[PDB]
Structure 1
Amino acid sequence: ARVKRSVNAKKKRREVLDQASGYRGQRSRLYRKAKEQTLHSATYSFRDRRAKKGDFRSLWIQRINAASRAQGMTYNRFINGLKNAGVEVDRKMLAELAVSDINAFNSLVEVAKASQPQN
């Protein structure tokens, strides 16, 4: 029962070389280099899937800060005022408002202002 390796062996090679189908140089042509690069790509993508939450939250916070500073309020005071007012709209929707519906955002800024400690 002598078995030849090729039929079983080429499957993972085809898979890896398909996953490396935009890489530059040896990384898209040779199975060993493509395998190393796919190891790195998997590590990178797992890490960036977790870092995406923080990245998008940072972008939302920056946009909310910019839109609330045009109304004379800092981001920290705006967030504290929305917390005190009870309006639980998250930073994703707050940034969506700050871009698309700036009048609704300014009304929310007024709501946050009226709900500050003022002390």
Structure 2
Amino acid sequence: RVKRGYIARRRRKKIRFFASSFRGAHSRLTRTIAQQKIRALVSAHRDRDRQKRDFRRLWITRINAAIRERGVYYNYSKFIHDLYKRQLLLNRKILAQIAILNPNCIYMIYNEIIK
């Protein structure tokens, strides 16, 4: 009742096709194709949570570098002082996006934070 099969080769060929552009025996050699599928997926996990964290960090330092161009000592903390006292609910650090896509509009943002 012999049971020679082919399902390991489709099982294995799917993982073989996912492991393209892995520079060498991480892209050809099955017994490393498996663990590069595995380590590639957990790399996708931690780099996804830390792409949320990392783009948060990037917008913080980008709008900090935008506000510090005034010359007078107005930090990023004081922009949030007078960004929540003057009631602006949650611009979500997308003013770090229109701070470079619309620099006159972020000058209107900050020049209305002053008043």
Q: Which residue of 2 aligns with 1:89?
A: 91
Deviations 1:52-99 (A, max 9, x none): 1111111111110111111242111112211111223110x2111111
User: What is the TM-score normalised by the length of structure 1?
Assistant: 0.86
Alignment of 1:23-42 (within 5 A): 23-42=22-41
Q: Which residue of 2 aligns with 1:4?
A: 4
**CA deviation after TM superposition for structure 1 residue 36, in Å:** 1.0
Identity %: 31
In terms of fraction of residues, the more helix-rich structure is: 1
Q: Which protein has greater RCO, CA pairs closer than 8 Å, 6+ apart? A: 1
> SS where residue 100 of structure 2 aligns?
helix
Number of aligned residue pairs: 112
Do residues 102 (structure 1) and 110 (structure 2) align?
Answer: no
Q: Which runs of 5+ in 1 are unaligned?
A: 115-119
Q: Which residue of 2 aligns with 1:117?
A: none
Do residues 46 (structure 1) and 45 (structure 2) align?
Answer: yes
Alignment of 1:69-80 (within 5 A): 69-71=68-70, 72=72, 73-80=74-81
Q: Which runs of 5+ in 2 are unaligned?
A: none
User: What is the TM-score normalised by the length of structure 2?
Assistant: 0.89
